Each structure stands twice: as C-alpha cells, then as structure tokens.
Amino acid sequence: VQQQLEALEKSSGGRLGVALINTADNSQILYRADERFAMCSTSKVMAAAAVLKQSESDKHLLNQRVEIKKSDLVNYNPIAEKHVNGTMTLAELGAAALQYSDNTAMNKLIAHLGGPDKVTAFARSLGDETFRLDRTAPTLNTAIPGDPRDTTTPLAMAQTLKNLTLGKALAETQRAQLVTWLKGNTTGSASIRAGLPKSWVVGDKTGSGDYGTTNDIAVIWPENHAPLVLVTYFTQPEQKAENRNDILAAAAKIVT
Ligand SMILES: *C(=O)[C@@H](NC(=O)Cc1ccccc1)[C@@H]1N[C@@H](C(=O)O)C(C)(C)S1
Ligand SMILES: CC1(C)S[C@@H]2[C@H](NC(=O)Cc3ccccc3)C(=O)N2[C@H]1C(=O)O
Ligand SMILES: CC1(C)S[C@@H]2[C@H](NC(=O)Cc3ccccc3)C(=O)N2[C@H]1C(=O)O
C-alpha cells in the first residue's frame, strides 16, 4: 500500500496525506500523517462539535435562533442565502455547515463560540494538540504551503474524528447527532466515497481551497467489519491548481 500511495502522489503533482484507523484492531495506514495540511472546510467538523459539546449542558442551545443578514453572506452560502432576513437555529447551522459546506453557517458557529481560538480550545479539550483554527471562512481556505494557520495533520484529525464519532469526545446524543450530520453530507460523492464499495455507509466532510487543496475526512461502516476512519488530505505547489477529488477517491481505494 505504501508504494501505491507513493506512486499516486508522484503522478499527482502534489503532497498527499493519509491516515486510516481500522477500529477492528487500532491498526493504521499512515502516509505523511504527521505533516501539517490546511484543513479547509474539514475544520467545520470541529466547530459543529464544539457547539454540540456546549449543548450537553444547555438543553435550549440547538434551537437558539440566529439572525441571518445579507452582510453575513460570503462566497458560498447555499442554505443561509435562503434565510436572509430570517433566522436559522444553531442545529440548522450545524447541518448546513456540515452537509452543504455553507460558509456563512460555519461563520455563525465560530461567532457563537467566540472566535477561531475557541474552536482550537475545544480541540485541545478533546486531546488534540495539533488542530488550530485561526480564521473565518472563506479565508481559512487560502491553504498556502507552509502556512500553519487553519491546519492539522492527517493522524491528528483521524484520531479526533474517531473520538468524535465513535469514541469518547461527546455524550451519546451529541455523538449521534454529529454522525447523523456527517452521514447526510451531500458534497462528498466524488471523494473518499467514490473509492469505496457503494453500499458501505459513510459519513464525511470535504474541503477545498487554493493550491488545489482537496480534502475529505470520513467515518466508514463496512457491512461485516468494524468501522474505519480515514483522512485524505492533498495539496499542490501552485496557487491556482485544480482541485482533485479523484486523488482522494484513489487513496481511499488503495488503503481499503
Ligand atoms: C471549504 O473547504 C470551503 N471552501 C471554500 O469556500 C473555497 C473554495 C475552494 C474551491 C472552490 C470553491 C470554494 C467549502 N467546502 C468545499 C468542499 O466541501 O469541497 C466547497 C468547494 C463545497 S466550498
Ligand atoms: C473552482 C471554481 C470553479 S469555484 C471557486 C470560487 N467560487 C466560490 O467560492 C463559490 C462557490 C463555492 C462552492 C461551490 C460553488 C461555488 C470561484 O470563483 N472558483 C472557481 C475557480 O477558481 O475556477
Ligand atoms: C462567485 C463569488 C461570490 S465566489 C468567487 C471568489 N471567492 C473564492 O474563490 C473563495 C475562496 C477564498 C479563499 C480561498 C479559496 C477560495 C470570489 O471572489 N468570487 C465571486 C465572484 O466572482 O463574484
């Protein structure tokens, strides 16, 4: 598998990061898994989960109404733009952020939490010393090579995604909500999911940025085996490189 991933990376003209955790036995498949990559919109999982954590101690939080103003709109707001002049609840914002990658929704989550550094503190509270959120959307997607802002490593994000969706991080109702959200993602068809058997159940969150940065983080439920957690991060040397969902599908196929 390592030679395959190396050849994929070489042909691709970029930098590939993979971390697979097989929860059957905690074995792992790692490729540049301790290297930093810009998370892009995969960071939205952490923001949504931070709000879910708060909701463990505030039974009214998810139904809290948030005003959506025309000035809130940014580059991509497929759900929030339907609600300008109206409200969305925090749950609706979590769903939009995760399932459509609505950037206004992400920003509402960040603002509710008190800014990017609060998302980082939430990651720390889960045992993730690697994640950092520095900016709002869409500037968190600049993905400049070597820029530490808005980065994590494939292994750190695989570990934390496992903890969030299958493990210790959230109380049960909140864990289940996060899983429901990820399973209902609409943006990932061509990424990790395209490299897997069609009937495996998947929850995932994609991201795309400059430098052709193309990411997906997934929890995978095979029909007859324990879950897998897979992070596929990819980035390229040139700022206007095309995004490459297909590389993520290829990586997923290789490691499964
Ligand atoms: C998160 O990664 C967001 N990315 C951007 O807003 C920048 C961008 C990059 C390329 C094309 C359009 C916008 C959102 N998440 C990604 C994703 O999930 O792949 C989108 C392309 C849906 S925008
Ligand atoms: C890659 C694109 C075809 S899309 C990206 C950007 N558009 C947006 O940020 C809005 C948008 C976001 C998500 C989905 C659709 C549109 C924008 O413009 N971009 C294009 C480009 O660089 O050629
Ligand atoms: C269609 C748009 C509203 S979105 C597109 C572009 N915005 C981006 O490309 C977002 C982005 C920011 C940072 C890193 C990557 C992508 C930008 O600006 N764009 C618009 C446009 O042409 O009017």
UniProtKB/Swiss-Prot annotation:
Annotated residues for binding of substrate: K205, T206, G207
Annotated protein name in UniProt: Beta-lactamase Toho-1
Quaternary state and interactors: Monomer.
Pfam annotation, one family: Beta-lactamase2
Protein encoded by which gene: bla
GO biological-process terms attached to the record: beta-lactam antibiotic catabolic process; response to antibiotic
Residue numbers annotated as active site: S41 (acyl-ester intermediate)
Family: Belongs to the class-A beta-lactamase family.
Entries under InterPro entries matching the protein: Beta-lactam/transpept-like (IPR012338), Beta-lactam_cat (IPR045155), Beta-lactam_class-A (IPR000871), Beta-lactam_class-A_AS (IPR023650)
Coiled-coil intervals: none
Keyword vocabulary terms for this entry: Antibiotic resistance, Hydrolase, Plasmid, Signal
Function per UniProt: Has strong cefotaxime-hydrolyzing activity.
NCBIfam families: bla_class_A, blaCTX-M
Organism: Escherichia coli
Annotated Gene3D superfamilies: DD-peptidase/beta-lactamase superfamily
Additional information: The class A beta-lactamase family has a specific amino-acid numbering system, sometimes called Ambler or ABL numbering and often misspelt as Amber. A multiple sequence alignment was used to derive a consensus sequence and then the consensus was numbered taking into account insertions and deletions. This allows use of identical numbers, e.g. for active site residues, despite differences in protein length. UniProt always uses natural numbering of residues, hence there appear to be differences in numbering between this entry and some papers.
GO MF annotation list: beta-lactamase activity
Transmembrane segments: none
EC number of this enzyme: 3.5.2.6
Lineage, top ranks: Bacteria, Pseudomonadati, Pseudomonadota, Gammaproteobacteria, Enterobacterales
